[PDB]
């Protein structure tokens, strides 16, 4: 299964517009993943990284995006914060793994890299595995916005500023979420 085409892409998605790649009808094997040394985070929920290679699933999904160091703890079941609530929501009965690694060498740039963005404003919490990519002006007050930025009328997406010198909590992290779905199995290790 083309794990490398997900982990090794050149740029990643912004969290608000997280990328989903279907993986189907291939052989899994989680050896080069788990037995890699370059992963700051590798947590599994509902399964077990040991006995991962010797099981089957109807379908697997790989969601990828970039967030701040301090936000990686929100890519987990039952978490709250701007990311979990308004950008990427894991379900409470999550069955899968979360992999994160520091990408300061790739996604920071002297002077600031502002290409990566997150949704700061949203009336309601995302549902699990919701992807909201609207850029409608957000009404914080009482007068309508009519798609014009102003007081009480804010663009809902905001840039991270990734500079190489920031502390690791402010540094970019590439995250990949592997979701296992047992609804006729087609992904085995």
């Amino acid at each position: 299964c083309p794990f490398g085409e997900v982990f090794n892409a050149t740029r990643f998605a912004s969290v608000y517009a997280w990328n989903r790649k279907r993986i189907s009808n291939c052989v899994a094997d989680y050896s080069v993943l788990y037995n890699s040394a370059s992963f700051s985070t590798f947590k599994c929920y509902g399964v077990s990284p040991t006995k991962l290679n010797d099981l089957c699933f109807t379908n697997v999904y790989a969601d990828s995006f970039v967030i701040r160091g301090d936000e990686v703890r929100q890519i987990a079941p039952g978490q709250t914060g701007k990311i979990a609530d308004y950008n990427y929501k894991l379900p409470d009965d999550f069955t899968g793994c979360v992999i994160a690694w520091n990408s300061n060498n790739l996604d920071s740039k002297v002077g600031g890299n502002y290409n990566y963005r997150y949704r700061l404003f949203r009336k309601s919490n995302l549902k699990p595995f919701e992807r909201d990519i609207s850029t409608e002006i957000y009404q914080a007050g009482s007068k309508p916005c009519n798609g014009v930025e102003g007081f009480n009328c804010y663009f809902p997406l905001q840039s991270y500023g990734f500079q190489p010198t920031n502390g690791v909590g402010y540094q970019p992290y590439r995250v990949v979420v592997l979701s296992f779905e047992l609804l006729p199995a087609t992904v085995c290790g």
Partner: antibody
Amino acid sequence: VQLVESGGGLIQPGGSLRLSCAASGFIVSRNYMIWVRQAPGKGLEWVSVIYSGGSTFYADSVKGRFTISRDNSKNTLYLQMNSLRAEDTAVYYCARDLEVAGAIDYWGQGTLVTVSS
Amino acid sequence: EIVLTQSPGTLSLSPGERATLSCRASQSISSSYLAWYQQKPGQAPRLLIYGATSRATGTPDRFSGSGSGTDFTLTINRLEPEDFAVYYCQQYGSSPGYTFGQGTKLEIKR
């Protein structure tokens, strides 16, 4: 647009109070809303935040005693304070927060809470 | 725990001089998450600068912000009499999510 605070007063150690913050112009339920407090002669201290989606976070010194909430019909923010100690004496501000889009740009006038016995 | 240490604790200048207030963070932070407030006795804080460099609504041009990483600075060019006040810095990026410095008092020199 304005934030008007009320409900402060004198209360005993261990007692309970509820602060309220009637908004105008701002819609409380669409904003990051915070309480910040200032003890007499000292600095600003962040107490609590409620997210427009309902998430709530609390400073360590008040976790388990204080409860932030809101009423969309009254357009008001509340702070329920239980197990009050002398050190909770302060002026309490509600304020609207815009994070990287503007920091804390509007603050109410403040309400005084004294915990004494 | 992130700590903002402001300096000096007290600045004494006369009107029309240049005021330089510093904020030092105990760890490196992105400049996006730093703000400056003015507070006059009896009143609520007034936001002056957010994102280290961006002027809030109603902040005259003599106020300017700068810095990154661990070090941030508020500059008042040509002090005015209404600028004598307490000045606070605030971070809003790191746990618990809101931290203020201890304050700098800008006072009249004589």
